[PDB]
Amino acid sequence: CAAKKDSLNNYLWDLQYDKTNILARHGETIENKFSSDSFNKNGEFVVVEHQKKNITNTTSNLSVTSANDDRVYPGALFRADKNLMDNMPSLISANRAPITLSVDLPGFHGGESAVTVQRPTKSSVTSAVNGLVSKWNAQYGASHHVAARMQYDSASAQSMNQLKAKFGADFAKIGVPLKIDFDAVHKGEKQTQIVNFKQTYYTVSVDAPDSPADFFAPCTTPDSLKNRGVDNKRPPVYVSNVAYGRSMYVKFDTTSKSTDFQAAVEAAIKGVEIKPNTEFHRILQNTSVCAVILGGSANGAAKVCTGNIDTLKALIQEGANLSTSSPAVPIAYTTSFVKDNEVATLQSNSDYIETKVSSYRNGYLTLDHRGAYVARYYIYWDEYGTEIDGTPYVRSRAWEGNGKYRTAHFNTTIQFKGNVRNLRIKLVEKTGLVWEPWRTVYDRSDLPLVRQRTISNWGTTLWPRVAETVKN
Template sequence: MTKIVLPFVMAFLFLACSENETMPVFDKVELNEYLNTLPSVLQIAPFEERKIIQKNARRDQYTLEEYEVAVGFDEQFLFNPSSEIFYPGSLVVASSVVQGSYKPISAPRAAIVLSTSLTGDKTSITVDSPKLSTTRDAISTLLKDRNFDIPPANLRYTTDEVFSNNHLKIALGGNYEGFGTNVSGSLAFNYEQETTKVVVKMIQKFYTIDVDVPDQSAAFFNESFDFKEKIVNHKPLYVSSVTYGRVFLMSIESTMSKVELEAALQASFLGGSVGVNAETEFGKIVKTSTIKATIVGGSATIAGQEIGDLSAVKEFIASGASYSKENPGLPIAYRLRELGNNEVFTNVLYSKYTKRVRVDQISNKSIDFDINLDWYGLKTKAGSVLKPERIFIKRVDVVTGKSNEKELFFGSEYKVKSRLELLTKKDKVYVVFRDYNNKDTHVFALPAMLDLIKKGLLTSNAHLYALDKSPLKTEELYHNSSILTLGIESYKIY
């Protein structure tokens, strides 16, 4: 009998030892240290719109200018509300967010607590094993089994001019490559046509569903896994908040100018209500435009439909305007945080695009710039330096004849700068040298303001004329015996 039992005992001990050997210990300290020391994903720093270069000359009334911009988004618009990736607590690879591909991270997860911004009842619920299905079930239970107060029905309106497909992503507020693009696709523009392209957004946020921020990174997980294989190179990101509500998107491609189009939109419905003259004003847009609309959330459903009147707008404003159990809204935006420091992740979207600028619009622009002078800038035509006694900047309104002037004083480095602002086509600027008896000795005129504005629109340089590299050299007006070298720098055109 002993001989029979012994093999079974040995086999049991062997299996037990084997199981113990393959059961790794969940080392939360090691995981925390690993996540905390991972760097954040690198991105371009946000910057305001800036001109790169004048793209090419044309023979009509337009010039082409190339611009670039980088905009940071703490919250991104959700193109596809049915996406299985964007739910509270989900983990994604940081570099994939920057690329727009959004790769999820699969790992054994610890329980999380979700809560809603709605008020009037218990706001939180625990999800024991967080994944898409269990999180959806928890949110459904939270919203249907409790009685929350109805939030205020506030609509927010925005309009953005669009110049390229990448620029459309900035206007919409989200970057997705290869999936979730049903909304952006329904708003596609024909960028080959020289038309004004505008995206109108009406956004109504009902509430948010948020996940409790973990005290430690490892608190997101409940058992050991190969985290160095699953999480590499950068801190991972998690969806910390999802906004539910509804969005009305309208794409307008029009032969109207941007100013005309925005004025008509404001008069029709962007003022916050659809007034008596709204249909008339919107009719002006319809006659010159192709208009498509898409609705995300709410009771009305439109997806990339062409519209010819304000009925869709009226329907959106009137129907499904309030949160209820029957109208809970759809996910329309989300916020990401870094696992490792819980800081809000700002996704930076970059775009480069070309603008058309009407040459005749230059006449309505104004310009600011610095006049940069040095002591040795005034010379005879033979090249001898003429030492200035007193120097003034004189500004003349050629329409009214009114003028004002400012005396300049050279500093210890024998240089002086003076800022001129809001100069227009009706302004003429002179640099005037006088003797100590207040008699004009040398008078120089700057180029016409329209010429400076046009030059500024056609260059990507920070200065129109840099004193140390490419200065302006101009002859005096009356005696034609001297030349002034100066800089016109740090310009800004409005």
């Protein structure tokens, strides 16, 4: 054999394809759209906002799963076809040439981090990797504690189409154990966040052969590949490397309408303060957590998704850093084109309708004037507003009964929109007298829009008294 060794850069160099479209997914388009509506169910008000948007995601690090684990190993050969874009690549069978592998892991000298597999197969490369790990845990197992390199991708749960673009075309079968309601998100009854965690201990990478022929046994002809589908329409790739560790999908969701939810979830991932009585604490204290852990082995799903922000922190610490000496499995793989050995990238493009939610709680102010003298109120507040276009404006208001000469037992209750700001209340009292003919009894500003507020004034013209109560 030789000269016949010109499947290399003669058929595999003359392959014609556009590296950046051969692995590109697109979804049907949606014309711009905007929509809103309000409930008024609880004492709350609630607004649901629907808006058209687009997700464009381009990644080279692809996820390992049960359905593809049998086909994912360093050195494996795939066609850059629809099977790879569905994260279910199809093996290119062929009498393979030997290939060399290498591993990170601290220590190792010269070539002890490398191993040569004579007949690359899922089984054979696995045993070759285990054997290379089976011994770094012998020369350096006690000399080094290998941490994990954490990496995650977060996305709001809006639609299956946009979640596939974010996490892979196979997400529907991964996100069944996660009981994503969607209907509840679209109705404003729920907020949900999906996070995919990848804790990497080590990666096995392939030593790029001298030539594309180096990959196949001798006397492998172009026609032999032009018969197993390898061609211009379906050019060949090889698994450049494979990440080993622990991976999982986590569903964060709550029934809160707070707009700080996403920011609070992500702050919990990062291990931050989130302090006793702040608002992030109160959101995370009612966030349902729902984890399903994966890898090679065979995933495993969970059970009933019952967990909280604490379950998360334990699994992180339980997967971060080394596990029971376990691999703990292959979690990700990267492919490269046979031609130039450049990393291939998958591109996803999808339009979707996002849903956003918000709510405010109306407040009440009751004024009980059970005291002598003639009372008099001066109440103001500001309405922060925004037109369509997003331009801001401020319109200040004044109580209908501002400065009215009250008299005996006067009682009334005022209703405030939840989005009122800078509330202002002043109470004066007529004392038939020159010098201080009106006398202030209550003068407070920058009041908090509480659910209920009661201001009780009494006394005489010489010494008016006043008390204040609140309620949430």
